[PDB]
């Protein structure tokens, strides 16, 4: 069946909740309203107030209580209304959730999922979220996933809900309804930690994920018009990321451009770039080039410019090709 | 005079027939009383104007403040604009208007034109003014509470005699920083006044699911400061209770927590749907409590209001609105370069390189 | 039947001369009363044994709990160990001991040997036990309050009939997460009991500079839940009030905030100088309120105590301490490889690589 | 005069406070106690409680109030007892402090300093050993400084206090009293944003800062005895970092090793490394090698195995030289 990302995410939750009574959804406006993006629409009506619960306006309480629920007996899927707003409950996430298994020598676990909309790139009247994944990746103990297709949304969210390790699930708001795709209604999951090959190429490797997907794909198309075959690789899982997939692609093409809308400095793509340089120096025909969000707060007026454009991506590709 | 704290019934001063209920004599001059009314009309009219800006696609987001007029106008008048500081949130454009912020700047911020002294950096409903000590609105709920406390402590140490008023909604009272900030202010006896514009909703989450304390005023007990429950639809009660707290703060007696019970007539925002979690009965019931008509009857009963005067005020207001919108628009779009300005006092090497990289595209 | 909330004077049940001050008649058998005393003595002696671990270098850090005994032992006995959950903080080793956590495991964590079920992953005073639902201590003040609220909500939804107790110092009540966590628990009517071990100090910062509310119990008004002011040096008053709060929570009536007023006799920690910011008049004054001698008098007045029993109890405790320490030490040092274990259920590629790299070293 | 880092820092605070009445210190146990590390010793008795104030135990209140004070007229130097405890006040730091100038179109400023002890090697476990600089560097609007000598301590803290931009000042606690270096009693400052050359060399570049300087400098010394001339560069300022100093050195030597005790993934050295590979691929004779802390919470038992050892650094140096 064809469906948008919102629909896929919703179906994933519905499916998992039907399979396990321990799966519960909690967060701001997730019940009666069905979420500000309707990701949890109809769930309260079907599963009740004990399975889907609106919480007070406190991210610390949301992340923290979820950790407590997970340690005790439930499989909570917490929602942070926007990736930007994870900060009020940052300590709960990094000091309690991330380190529970480690500090307790394995006596206590955190089978919980924290989903959240992120990025800008769309003016639907909603808050533009500066992608904070780097903060999570830098914190040992958290698995981080960022989806970009309805098919992946369902497969991976279900995977996260079954995964015993804490998973931070990022959903690019601009992609919630940007395009429909065939999404099997049958039960299926995707593997966390594995990248997805969107397009095969041999001249250039385009490493990306989430928010920037649209521009990256069109850039590959433009490149094709010029006789350049670009391999588009959607990492999907930022931690642990698909080391093999990355290195095999760069080894092949010899030149790579990494794209993301997250701030440049100490960003996740910076990590991948630095790792490519440390391990495949001998396979590089050009310097690993990073196309990222600028090192400024997310600008509302210049949203069109902050989010990497097809042009910005192509200029980097050219630089990598002409090198 | 001193109002009762933690009252079971919210404090009221305006009777339903325009009768004065105070246990102290009304001391507002006739002019000042009419001004409070004028500003509430202006606030209401600005709000309805915002509705049109959305419909016409001029702005991408609004947070309807209809119903908060009495509370917002009262606060604006309980302090000394330009002198005292204000730490507001996104729904306070009524307070911003009454405080004296130029429409050109408010609408400029809404349209993200060069008219916005905040340079179109944030989405609509994020005004900010250095001239009027209106601390620029931040997106994360209650994140402005701790700063308000610091400003107040600064005012105390520097003996400026200023006071810092901090406004927020009911939902914000659930955040940890809300509690942490006020606690520090109370311990330092800082001249800060925390005011809740309680509309019983945090988007769709109702008060009952927000907190278990019967009122927000009761939370003051956690800081050992006075807490007040006021009828936020009564501009006089709101004005006087807040004014008293401001004076208490100004004279070094520490902070206060004032709860102004109001109602959000419109949806949470232009991105929300009120008629999706609220019974038409509840809304209609509070509609009868509109603060504007209520205060009108009070002035009417004293020969301080008449149809002719109203029309005169409304006409002068709608003209000001059109003039303000015009100036805001003719200001022009904010330049793309400004994207790298104000991150720091001066642009560092990496921003210079990044700003240059953007030009390869512009 | 029911204690008064927000009382002007802290609730006390033991008179100055060992008399019972309760309205209701005492309902604890003599055996149980002696147990309470025994546990307090064990707690106090564990603390002093910790002091020696510092002096001999066996452990690098300790948080003296002397003075907290009545509160900690009372809490351990107001709940059902192994059934209810406990969310403690670093200074609760006395509570951990009375709750039944093996000395082997406590001392093992203090010394970071294989005897520590927490595998020596954290610095001393960070005990944790799966078997006894003692949620492993975390360092950030009050960070365990939201989780406690969550577990409680879980108990409610799963209708396990369990209760979750959460202990913390006075300083912790100033953190935003403290307020946020409790607020949520209160809204959900969760079976959680929040207990403050108020010793009037957060290291060197005194209560006066910590918060402006006259008491911590008053803070309960912010959540619409009942708040209790108790003499934390009175093991009976502490047991009964916490007990009542726990029963209230267990029957689905929601959380409560219980303030147990105590005093920290030792310095904040082994890395501090107590007699550097506290008036000797204050310390002396409170040293005469020691919970142990106070309950001793209560037992003595009822024929439940005598000098000879005191000696035997102390000697039994001392022997246990030695046995426990010996077992913890003989467990051996934790393997170096354990450093890469438990970050996740299984080690991802980058940890395997990092571990491998280190092994080549 | 000869003094420890603690003395130098205390001297700096005292100097600036005598110089400007607006300078105030606030934090947990900074007053009567003089600080848990004595950095603020004696300031209270000299300047009074209204300039050196003990705060309630709330990092959000500390950072946020400091922000409010700075915006209104004071020049606060806030202290976070341990860098590990910055999280409860994270939102205040990244949402209020970092973006104030930006979101207000320059109408409001944040002339504040946030001091905090950091780094491992002190048996601190999970929350008395962290080096969270990455979290800060990734946040636009914050200047980040990490010192390693008493001389730099005084010079850079004084600089920070005079800088109108928010500065997060990290102090490696293991170095608080590691040595008594010469520190002028006269008034002087140091430039924020400029690395400090510790050793001039031409066979290898060693980029580092803070906590690890002891092992790095010692690694250099041992490389000398072995005939290798390594250039040691202490960045000092992580944001904005000395781009020129770094590129020049690497340009010369052709091979670089970056050392830090901060977790590897999305760390600060990962940023510099990725940037070196992007702008000087042509000058690299070997892959940029990173010797960092492991991607795990800071372990207590294996404390000494976590912190980079001289051996670990030498091994990295060897790979760079044998490449
Ligand atoms: C930290 C954080 N979490 C979530 C949001 C999304 N959000 C925006 S407005 C809002 C409701 C706040 O309600 P209240 O404080 O009662 O104010 P009102 O809008 O009702 O006047 C929420 C949850 C946010 N801005 N910040
Ligand atoms: C978030 C955070 N900030 C600071 C510290 C450092 N610290 C450790 S113990 C302590 C005192 C806490 O006092 P209180 O809660 O009264 O407990 P007590 O030690 O008195 O029993 C402080 C400030 C910390 N652990 N966590
Ligand atoms: C504009 C903001 C203050 C409120 C909506 C949001 O946070 O997305
Ligand atoms: Mg509201
Ligand atoms: Mg204490």
The strand line-up of the biggest sheet of chain B is 1-2-3-7-6
Q: CATH homologous superfamily name of the largest domain in chain A?
A: Thiamin diphosphate (ThDP)-binding fold, Pyr/PP domains
Q: Which H/E pattern describes the elements of chain A?
A: EHEHEHEHHEHEHEEEEHEEHEHEHH
Strand content of chain B is 5-15%
Bound molecules: thiamine diphosphate, 4-methyl valeric acid, magnesium ion
- Write down the overall geometry of chain A: globular
Q: State the helicity of chain A in percent bands.
A: 25-40%
- The multimeric state of the shown protein is heterotetramer
**In percent, how helical is the residue content of chain B?**
40-55%
Secondary structural class of chain B = alpha/beta
Strand content of chain A: 15-25%
Got a strand count of chain A?
14
Radius of gyration of chain A equals 19 Å
The separation of the N and C termini of chain B measures 63 Å
Taken in chain order, the helices and strands of chain B follow as HHEHHHEHEEEHEHEHHHH
Number of separate helices of chain B: 12
PDB class: oxidoreductase
Keywords: alpha(2)beta(2) tetramer, structural genomics, RIKEN Structural Genomics/Proteomics Initiative, rsgi, Oxidoreductase
Assembly: tetrameric
Entry title: branched-chain 2-oxo acid dehydrogenase (E1) from Thermus thermophilus HB8 with 4-methylpentanoate
